[PDB]
Amino acid sequence: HVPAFLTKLWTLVSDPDTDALICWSPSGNSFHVFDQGQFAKEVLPKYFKHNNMASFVRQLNMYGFRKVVHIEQGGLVDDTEFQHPCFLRGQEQLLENIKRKV
Amino acid sequence: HVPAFLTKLWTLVSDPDTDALICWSPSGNSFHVFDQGQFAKEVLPKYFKHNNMASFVRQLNMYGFRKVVDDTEFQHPCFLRGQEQLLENIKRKV
Amino acid sequence: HVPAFLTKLWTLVSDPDTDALICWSPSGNSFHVFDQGQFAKEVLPKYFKHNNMASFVRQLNMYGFRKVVHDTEFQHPCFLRGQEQLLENIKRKV
DNA sequence: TGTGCGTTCTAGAATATTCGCGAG
DNA sequence: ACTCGCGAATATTCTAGAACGCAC
Ligand code: NA
């Protein structure tokens, strides 16, 4: 029913063993990826058939996720945050409302 | 969605800790940059991918700011102290 | 007249310091990137205003580079070891 | 028995940065 | 000769197109 990408992403974010690399934000309305390098090489191949952050990012955009911009990035002086309105901590059933672009 | 340049400009002008280098005018309808040299060298690279005052000014003109005729003053009709919601009306040129 | 990206890219690839992360292929008609995590974190910000491999890859495509399918290998016919003069022919997409 | 999903490589679109022109 | 808005090329970021394999 719910496509594999969303259930794995939900499980991956919620899993407390991965919270050093991917976890919910305190509000539970977005998720963070820390150290993209270790995440792509260590975490992604355990759920998907690849280890590329770009292929994970491409899927995020296919399901309508958007990157959250922090106002402190953009200067010359690793935290990647994504959000979807129906991807909320404690609301796994809401994943049926997220559906992929055709 | 309000572009990063205006949000950063609003934060930088409004911030009282930076007022020795960039701050609102007393009326709050314009802002001043003092000592452009130290501002470009020390403040800009903490917010933008450069330390060039010309590139900051170029963006000011891109968003329709104009210079009011060291001490450099710039103005935009929708860049007003206490009216942060008006940044939504500032649009980049075509 | 040669854009900064091509001169910097030729320089960083040719640099024997970085050959552990980015170097020419034996034939010298393509270049390899090993461990892009460390390449993006340490090499890119020394030449560009960022440390994202995606922003490096995007520029490679804007200049007509192509990824060769088999760590990470890219090629352009006018990007050859010892022929910095051929970069003159690599022209950026509109 | 066609359609939706996943992975990869490249391009689109908006804003950002640089350089130098020219009206006044 | 000089100031100050520009145009234009390139740079950076985030999202999408397109091709192909796979499943049901
Ligand atoms: Na200030």
How far CA B24 is from CA of A23, B16, B51, B56, B84, in Å, comes to: 40, 10, 21, 17, 13
- Given CA atoms A16, A18, A20, A22 in this order, what sign does their dihedral have? negative
Name the region of B9 (left: φ>0; alpha: ψ -120 to 50; beta: rest): alpha
Q: Rounded to whole angstroms, how far apart are CA atoms B73 and C69?
A: 55
Residue numbers of the domain that contains B63? 1-94
Length of chain A: 102
Comparing CA positions, the residue from B5, B1, B4 lying closest to residue B65 is B5
Cβ–Cβ contact B1 with A under 8 A: no
Question: Residue C80 has which token pair?
Answer: 């050859």
Question: Residue A56 has which token pair?
Answer: 């994970």
- Computed on alpha carbons and rounded to an integer, the radius of gyration of chain C in Å comes to 12
Comparing CA positions, the residue from C16, C34, C32, C36 lying closest to residue C24 is C32
Q: Rounded to whole angstroms, how far apart are CA atoms C65 and C76?
A: 5
Residue with tokens 């290998």: C73
How far CA C75 is from CA of A6, C5, C57, C72, C78, in Å, comes to: 36, 15, 12, 10, 9
Residue with nearest Cα to nucleotide D15 C1': B3
- Given CA atoms B59, B63, B64, B65 in this order, what sign does their dihedral have? negative
The amino acid present at C74, given as its one-letter code, is: F
The amino acid present at B89, given as its one-letter code, is: N
Chain B window 23-42: which residues touch A at a Cβ cutoff of 8 Å?
none
> 3-class DSSP state for residue A36?
helix
Which residues neighbour strand D (beta carbon < 7 Å)? A 3-5, 48-50, 52, 54-55, 58-59, 62, 74, 99-100, 102; B 3-5, 48-50, 52, 54-55, 58-59, 62, 92; C 49, 57-58, 61-62, 65-67, 69, 93
Task: Measuring from the CA of residue A73 to each C1' atom, give the nucleotide at the shortest distance.
Answer: E13
Shortest distance between the Cα of B61 and any Cα of chain A, in A, equals 20
Residue with nearest Cα to nucleotide E14 C1': A67
- Computed on alpha carbons and rounded to an integer, the radius of gyration of chain B in Å comes to 12
Question: Residue B4 has which token pair?
Answer: 């990063």
Q: Rounded to whole angstroms, how far apart are CA atoms A82 and A25?
A: 10
Q: Rounded to whole angstroms, how far apart are CA atoms A64 and A66?
A: 6
Task: Give backbone dihedrals phi and psi of B47, rounded to 5 degrees, phi first.
Answer: -120, -30
Question: Residue A71 has which token pair?
Answer: 């106002």
The amino acid present at C86, given as its one-letter code, is: L
* Number of domain units in chain B: 1
DSSP assignment letter at A28: S
Distance B21 CA to ligand 1 centre (A): 7
- Please write down the HEC assignment for all residues of chain B: CCCHHHHHHHHHHHCHHHCCCEEECCCCCCEEEECHHHHHHHHHHHCCCCCCHHHHHHHHHHCCCEECCCEEEEECCCCCCCCHHHHHHCCCCC
Question: Residue B54 has which token pair?
Answer: 């010309």
Half-sphere exposure for A70 (CA within 13 Å, toward CB): 11
Q: Rounded to whole angstroms, how far apart are CA atoms B51 and C22?
A: 29
Burial label for A52, CB within 10 Å (0-12, 13-18, 19+), is middle
Ranges of H-type helices in C1-94: 4-14, 36-42, 53-62
